[PDB]
């Protein structure tokens, strides 16, 4: 089985401000401007080479906020 995963933010959806907040909660140390630029630049990677549980939690939190995500 695959041992590490990337999380791609594909689209922010209708509630971009909320998605910026969720991205900042998920990604430790991500600054405010960096998070805004990541969301405005989607599709963009959010997490790279992380554990499956961390990827699944990130996807669930972002999707609940209206975003579209791919775990790879």
Resolution at which this structure was determined, Å? 1.5
Beta bridge partners of 70: 8
Peptide bond preceding 43: is omega within 30 degrees of 0, i.e. cis?
Answer: yes
Among the listed residues 2, 6, 1, 4, the one whose alpha carbon sits nearest the alpha carbon of residue 71: 6
Beta bridge partners of 45: 8
Residues found in the chain: 72
Number of domains in the chain: 1
Contacts of 68 (CB under 8 A, 6+ apart): 9, 10, 11, 13
Cα distance between residue 7 and residue 13, in whole Å = 16
If residue 64 lies in a helix (H) or strand (E), which one and from where to where?
helix 52-64
Write the CA distances from 15 to 9, 53, 63, integer angstroms: 14, 25, 11
Pairing of strands 68-71, 44-50: unpaired
Domain with 61, as residue range(s), is 5-71
Find the CATH number of the domain harbouring 24: 3.30.1390.10
Cα distance between residue 20 and residue 37, in whole Å = 9
């Amino acid at each position: 089985e695959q041992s590490e995963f990337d999380v791609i933010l594909e689209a922010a959806g209708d509630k971009k401000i909320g998605v910026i907040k969720v991205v900042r909660e998920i990604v430790s140390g991500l600054g405010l401007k960096e998070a805004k630029d990541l969301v405005d630049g989607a599709p963009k990677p959010l997490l790279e080479k992380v554990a499956k549980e961390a990827a699944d939690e990130a996807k669930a939190k972002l999707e609940a906020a209206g975003a579209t995500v791919t775990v790879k």
